[PDB]
Amino acid sequence: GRPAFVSRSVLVTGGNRGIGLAIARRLAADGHKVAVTHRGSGAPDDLFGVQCDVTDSAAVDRAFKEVEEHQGPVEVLVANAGISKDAFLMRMTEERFEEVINTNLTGAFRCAQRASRTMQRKRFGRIIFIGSVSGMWGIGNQANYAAAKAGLIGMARSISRELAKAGVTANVVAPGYIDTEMTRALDERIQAGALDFIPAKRVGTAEEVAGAVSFLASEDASYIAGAVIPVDGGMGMGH
Amino acid sequence: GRPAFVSRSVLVTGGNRGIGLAIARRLAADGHKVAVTHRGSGAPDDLFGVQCDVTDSAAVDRAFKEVEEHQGPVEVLVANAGISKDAFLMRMTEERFEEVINTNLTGAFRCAQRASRTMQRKRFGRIIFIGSVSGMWGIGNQANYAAAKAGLIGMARSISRELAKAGVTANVVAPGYIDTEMTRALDERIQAGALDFIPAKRVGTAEEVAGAVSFLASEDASYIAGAVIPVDGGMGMGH
Amino acid sequence: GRPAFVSRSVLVTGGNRGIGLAIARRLAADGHKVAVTHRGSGAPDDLFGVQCDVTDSAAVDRAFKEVEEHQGPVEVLVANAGISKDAFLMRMTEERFEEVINTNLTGAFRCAQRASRTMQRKRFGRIIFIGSVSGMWGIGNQANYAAAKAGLIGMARSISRELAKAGVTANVVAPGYIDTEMTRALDERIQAGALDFIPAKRVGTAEEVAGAVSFLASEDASYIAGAVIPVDGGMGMGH
Amino acid sequence: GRPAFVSRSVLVTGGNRGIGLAIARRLAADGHKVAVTHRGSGAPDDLFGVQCDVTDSAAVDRAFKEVEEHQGPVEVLVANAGISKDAFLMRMTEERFEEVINTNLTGAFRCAQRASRTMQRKRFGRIIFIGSVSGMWGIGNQANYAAAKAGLIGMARSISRELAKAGVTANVVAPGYIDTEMTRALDERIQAGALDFIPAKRVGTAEEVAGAVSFLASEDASYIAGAVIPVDGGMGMGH
């Protein structure tokens, strides 16, 4: 039956709002030791918050060290931090592309690398990247966001092929449209016709994404590596 | 946090041995009402067993009716029944191909269709096909088994696109090499070199597969449709 | 500069009309020796026809013998035979499911199996399955057609993993909506909004599908194995 | 019979040696007008060379201007520039990750973005990214290279979803192990067993990759958008 629960040291980057906050709150109610990074606004509830600029490898190192001094080495990393900056291809600047790449993809690398030091040594790690349906489905006007979120799949698979033998796995949770992430633009997209692409005919909730992360942080996911778990109501189905 | 547990009416086909038995036992310990089909040897533990020849649409109908009279309409169908009959392509007979197709693919259709009658009406259904790494990875000498297990993905996605709006989802759990499913031939394959293709460098356990099925049967999987959840230690990574 | 052309012995199953016709005509205009199977309608133009029902393994054997005596053993097999028979899941009968499986999936196996012995001896073979966007995208009301066309992918990959080392490869061309296959019902579906699913905003032509098959039959595809080549205007993009 | 050839304005980035050289030579022998970017080594044969560092958006702009003045605006862009810099995850520095991202992923964006305005106006464009089996298969020690090459897929699909309706498509050619790219270390890895990962049991040739690019630049690929064409001997098969 159900394996005994283990309280893991968890770090959720960008875990102070939206999807990240739902993940942090769910993992904490699961019984884990949950820390979050933010960019200044502060941590939620009673969760341990650390400020972190995920474009700065020095800040990532110091943020991880502050977490380790508080709750011990990170066993479950949820790399949720990341921005969206949409544009038509011909209107997308170098700066708009690189900023989304640096925060969403390189930022996730910086955290995964910094986490791997103790994970490999302790022979246990769950690296959980928050991707997007856009990575493999290609939402228009997202050359930068879709590249960053597809890049997480390649990185997770390279990490898993190297380190799964040492008990360190890397997987991607790929949300579709999620209520806490809905902007004016996304809402108008739904009204215009985007729901036709979603079999479930509704947006998801942040708590639905948190439920998949809870699974991947649990004792029931030890043989899952390099997987993309879509939480999108079927939107991303294809090849 | 964690949503309240709902005890669901569960049917696990071929749930009397190997992976199916681990699934049935896990879902029962989760708190669900679990029935299993078998081909005569009998049901395990105290689980409600029904005999069922999944090549016979009439037997599937009568098997589902016996389950419904016992525990109510099936809310979670785990289509685990299926045989393996390997051969080199040039040595594979029509009978060897069709028998694996009929039990693994058409058999899963017969159950999914028979389950959909009440699922659609009650606006809740979890159809969980047990696939295989071979469906998308192509283990050699498995023209029939890989076709049947890839076919489950197409079927699950067509079902989900039609019925996810009515709360009925279809997903695939795709195991890799699993300890209870190891034959002499598969064991010799591992010794010859098959472990090199598995990042985790070990076979999985039936209880690891059961852990993913437990997730997909749970209240944490409502926005997941048409997904392939690989339980393979990273073996199936690719495109 | 470019590779010298080699005239191959080609068999196109179901090449009397639509996509199969365009494939047969293109491969013949390429310089290949093109035989076509049919069920009474005959072969197009001056091409060598053989009457063959791909649900009948004895007819497949006889058809390959006639092709071998006429133009030498088949070097490039294009398995195009097979049709859809749509229905909502709850309305789909066993017969409607199995008829589609037997023609599209098992029929393609019968032909690939019969071709395989001589391809292996000559250390050259191109097995080209004609799939569908539905295999991985899951068009609603196609539990049978999506299962069959996704099954082709698993079969192609198992065949490739077994035989690519002998120069025998299997690949899938996966058309989206194609003009010659547009029925009144599909046209009304496209008119009602299904054109929004296609980034190209138009249906494809049978000649556009034939162009992909021409490539896979050519000297420029020797290192391609287990691939799905989508000819769908972007419709199928996803995971 | 077959489509009439159209001589396209082609730009191959990093076309001085290896795969890029073979692509440039093949597209020129096809009849195209082929320009090549380089960083000092020059263009092959009689082809028009432009010195361009694809990490520099100003150099990309200047390079496209030189190509436009010489042969007309780019109709077919082959984004081949970019190299690997492998390391175990724990040993990979920020610089080693970002250098690979900036050349392979951001560099391809800079070129696709700069090409896009004129392609849209003329309602014709072929953006062809050169990816890698590693993007979806995850070669170990390539967190950076797999992330960059998987990122190309997401970018190609977002571009296709946006612009395919204007006749501008983006696709990825994903080579496996190719002779011209085989270093001493890769050769020793293949010798040590990595050849078992390749069903074809051999490395590919640069000319085999060029054959796939030739197809995607041709009149036979108008309805292909967001596709990954693997040229890997079957190595990358999976999900």
PDB file of N, CA and C in Angstrom, chain C residues 16 35 38 49-50 59 76 95 115 117 134 140 142 154 159 162 167 187 193-194 197 199 219-220 224-225 234-236:
ATOM      1  N   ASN C  16      -5.332   3.582 -55.655  1.00  0.00           N
ATOM      2  CA  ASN C  16      -6.236   3.879 -56.765  1.00  0.00           C
ATOM      3  C   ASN C  16      -6.761   5.312 -56.736  1.00  0.00           C
ATOM      4  N   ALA C  35       4.061  -0.412 -58.351  1.00  0.00           N
ATOM      5  CA  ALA C  35       2.886  -1.266 -58.336  1.00  0.00           C
ATOM      6  C   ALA C  35       1.894  -0.730 -57.311  1.00  0.00           C
ATOM      7  N   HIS C  38      -5.322  -2.667 -55.114  1.00  0.00           N
ATOM      8  CA  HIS C  38      -6.677  -2.140 -55.172  1.00  0.00           C
ATOM      9  C   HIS C  38      -7.640  -3.286 -54.893  1.00  0.00           C
ATOM     10  N   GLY C  49      -1.201  -3.030 -61.517  1.00  0.00           N
ATOM     11  CA  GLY C  49      -2.148  -3.241 -60.441  1.00  0.00           C
ATOM     12  C   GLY C  49      -2.219  -4.689 -59.993  1.00  0.00           C
ATOM     13  N   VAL C  50      -2.460  -4.878 -58.696  1.00  0.00           N
ATOM     14  CA  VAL C  50      -2.748  -6.191 -58.133  1.00  0.00           C
ATOM     15  C   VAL C  50      -3.971  -6.061 -57.235  1.00  0.00           C
ATOM     16  N   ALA C  59      -4.005 -12.993 -49.476  1.00  0.00           N
ATOM     17  CA  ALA C  59      -3.991 -12.076 -50.613  1.00  0.00           C
ATOM     18  C   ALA C  59      -2.738 -11.205 -50.619  1.00  0.00           C
ATOM     19  N   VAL C  76      10.618  -0.590 -51.600  1.00  0.00           N
ATOM     20  CA  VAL C  76       9.975   0.531 -50.927  1.00  0.00           C
ATOM     21  C   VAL C  76       8.502   0.173 -50.842  1.00  0.00           C
ATOM     22  N   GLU C  95     -17.272  -3.959 -34.043  1.00  0.00           N
ATOM     23  CA  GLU C  95     -17.039  -4.140 -35.474  1.00  0.00           C
ATOM     24  C   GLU C  95     -16.429  -2.893 -36.101  1.00  0.00           C
ATOM     25  N   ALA C 115       7.122  -8.075 -46.752  1.00  0.00           N
ATOM     26  CA  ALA C 115       8.216  -7.431 -47.461  1.00  0.00           C
ATOM     27  C   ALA C 115       9.562  -7.696 -46.815  1.00  0.00           C
ATOM     28  N   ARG C 117      11.478 -10.140 -45.475  1.00  0.00           N
ATOM     29  CA  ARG C 117      12.513 -11.155 -45.657  1.00  0.00           C
ATOM     30  C   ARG C 117      13.470 -10.763 -46.778  1.00  0.00           C
ATOM     31  N   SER C 134      -4.111  12.316 -36.342  1.00  0.00           N
ATOM     32  CA  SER C 134      -4.964  11.823 -35.263  1.00  0.00           C
ATOM     33  C   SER C 134      -4.229  10.865 -34.327  1.00  0.00           C
ATOM     34  N   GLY C 140     -11.263  13.884 -32.089  1.00  0.00           N
ATOM     35  CA  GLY C 140     -12.417  13.306 -31.428  1.00  0.00           C
ATOM     36  C   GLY C 140     -13.210  12.423 -32.376  1.00  0.00           C
ATOM     37  N   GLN C 142     -12.574   9.279 -32.999  1.00  0.00           N
ATOM     38  CA  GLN C 142     -11.660   8.418 -33.732  1.00  0.00           C
ATOM     39  C   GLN C 142     -10.898   7.499 -32.796  1.00  0.00           C
ATOM     40  N   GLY C 154       4.454   2.864 -33.109  1.00  0.00           N
ATOM     41  CA  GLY C 154       5.094   1.818 -32.330  1.00  0.00           C
ATOM     42  C   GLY C 154       5.633   0.703 -33.202  1.00  0.00           C
ATOM     43  N   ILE C 159      10.216  -2.194 -35.571  1.00  0.00           N
ATOM     44  CA  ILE C 159      10.843  -2.704 -36.788  1.00  0.00           C
ATOM     45  C   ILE C 159      12.200  -2.035 -37.008  1.00  0.00           C
ATOM     46  N   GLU C 162      14.878  -3.248 -34.667  1.00  0.00           N
ATOM     47  CA  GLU C 162      15.327  -4.588 -35.036  1.00  0.00           C
ATOM     48  C   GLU C 162      16.188  -4.583 -36.296  1.00  0.00           C
ATOM     49  N   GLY C 167      19.940  -2.086 -42.836  1.00  0.00           N
ATOM     50  CA  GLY C 167      19.536  -1.158 -43.870  1.00  0.00           C
ATOM     51  C   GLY C 167      18.050  -1.117 -44.146  1.00  0.00           C
ATOM     52  N   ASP C 187     -15.639  18.786 -44.282  1.00  0.00           N
ATOM     53  CA  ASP C 187     -15.697  20.165 -44.757  1.00  0.00           C
ATOM     54  C   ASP C 187     -16.535  21.032 -43.827  1.00  0.00           C
ATOM     55  N   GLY C 193     -15.011  25.686 -37.727  1.00  0.00           N
ATOM     56  CA  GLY C 193     -13.952  26.170 -36.863  1.00  0.00           C
ATOM     57  C   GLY C 193     -12.708  25.305 -36.805  1.00  0.00           C
ATOM     58  N   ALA C 194     -12.780  24.082 -37.338  1.00  0.00           N
ATOM     59  CA  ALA C 194     -11.634  23.186 -37.231  1.00  0.00           C
ATOM     60  C   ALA C 194     -10.429  23.698 -38.012  1.00  0.00           C
ATOM     61  N   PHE C 197      -7.591  24.907 -35.952  1.00  0.00           N
ATOM     62  CA  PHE C 197      -6.593  23.964 -35.472  1.00  0.00           C
ATOM     63  C   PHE C 197      -5.374  23.874 -36.383  1.00  0.00           C
ATOM     64  N   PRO C 199      -2.368  25.723 -38.183  1.00  0.00           N
ATOM     65  CA  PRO C 199      -1.633  26.993 -38.310  1.00  0.00           C
ATOM     66  C   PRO C 199      -1.537  27.501 -39.738  1.00  0.00           C
ATOM     67  N   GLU C 219      17.205   8.588 -52.116  1.00  0.00           N
ATOM     68  CA  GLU C 219      18.541   8.367 -51.588  1.00  0.00           C
ATOM     69  C   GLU C 219      18.899   9.336 -50.464  1.00  0.00           C
ATOM     70  N   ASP C 220      18.025  10.285 -50.124  1.00  0.00           N
ATOM     71  CA  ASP C 220      18.323  11.268 -49.088  1.00  0.00           C
ATOM     72  C   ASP C 220      17.741  10.920 -47.722  1.00  0.00           C
ATOM     73  N   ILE C 224      17.313   7.844 -41.647  1.00  0.00           N
ATOM     74  CA  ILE C 224      16.085   8.216 -40.956  1.00  0.00           C
ATOM     75  C   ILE C 224      15.345   6.938 -40.598  1.00  0.00           C
ATOM     76  N   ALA C 225      15.058   6.757 -39.309  1.00  0.00           N
ATOM     77  CA  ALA C 225      14.453   5.520 -38.843  1.00  0.00           C
ATOM     78  C   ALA C 225      13.547   5.821 -37.658  1.00  0.00           C
ATOM     79  N   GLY C 234       1.152  22.173 -39.468  1.00  0.00           N
ATOM     80  CA  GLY C 234       1.382  22.485 -38.070  1.00  0.00           C
ATOM     81  C   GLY C 234       0.310  21.987 -37.129  1.00  0.00           C
ATOM     82  N   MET C 235      -0.743  21.341 -37.645  1.00  0.00           N
ATOM     83  CA  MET C 235      -1.887  21.002 -36.798  1.00  0.00           C
ATOM     84  C   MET C 235      -1.487  20.142 -35.609  1.00  0.00           C
ATOM     85  N   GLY C 236      -0.574  19.196 -35.821  1.00  0.00           N
ATOM     86  CA  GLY C 236      -0.308  18.168 -34.833  1.00  0.00           C
ATOM     87  C   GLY C 236       0.689  18.508 -33.757  1.00  0.00           C
TER      88      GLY C 236
END
